[PDB]
Amino acid sequence: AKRKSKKNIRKQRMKILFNVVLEAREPGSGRRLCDLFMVKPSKKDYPDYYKIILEPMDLKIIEHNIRNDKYAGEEGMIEDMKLMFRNARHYNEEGSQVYNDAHILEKLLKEKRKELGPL
Ligand code: NI
Ligand code: NI
Ligand code: NI
């Protein structure tokens, strides 16, 4: 009874938080901030990326995890998002566009979670 309704609220919330990252655009240009986070770089094309980033993460993986109910709650999805953003900021230089995008997308995610409030 009360547990299927609670699983669905959690799953809904996870969709809302995912969609915030997916849809965010740069003011002025309309550039979609999430473009370079959608799929991890090709290992064949950029092997050095995988010597720096030991646990890769991208939105394709997180989308798969959401849809296949692999996360117990949004805190698990958020930890994957945070790993993705940390990877971006570890690999890319400070003041690069991808570095700044990771920062802004992480703030948007955190702000939308506070807006949703406690379960
Ligand atoms: Ni390093
Ligand atoms: Ni799978
Ligand atoms: Ni800032």
Author numbering: 478 to 596
Question: What do the authors say?
Answer:
BRDs are evolutionarily conserved and present in diverse nuclear proteins comprising HATs (GCN5, PCAF), ATP-dependent chromatin-remodeling complexes (BAZ1B), helicases (SMARCA), methyltransferases (MLL, ASH1L), transcriptional coactivators (TRIM/TIF1, TAFs) transcriptional mediators (TAF1), nuclear-scaffolding proteins (PB1), and the BET family (Muller et al., 2011). The most notable structural difference within the BRD core fold is a hairpin insertion located between helix αZ and the ZA loop that is present in all family VIII members. The proximity to the Kac binding site suggests that this insert may play a role in recruitment of acetylated binding partners. The nuclear body protein SP140 as well as the related protein LOC93349 and PCAF showed nonspecific binding to most peptides. In contrast, the second, fourth, fifth, and sixth BRD of PB1, MLL, and TRIM28 interacted with only a few histone Kac peptides.
Bromodomains (BRDs) are protein interaction modules that specifically recognize ε-N-lysine acetylation motifs, a key event in the reading process of epigenetic marks. The 61 BRDs in the human genome cluster into eight families based on structure/sequence similarity. Despite large sequence variations, all BRD modules share a conserved fold that comprises a left-handed bundle of four α helices (αZ, αA, αB, αC), linked by loop regions of variable length (ZA and BC loops), which line the Kac binding site and determine binding specificity. The four helices form a deep cavity that is extended by the two loop regions (ZA and BC loops), creating a largely hydrophobic Kac binding pocket.
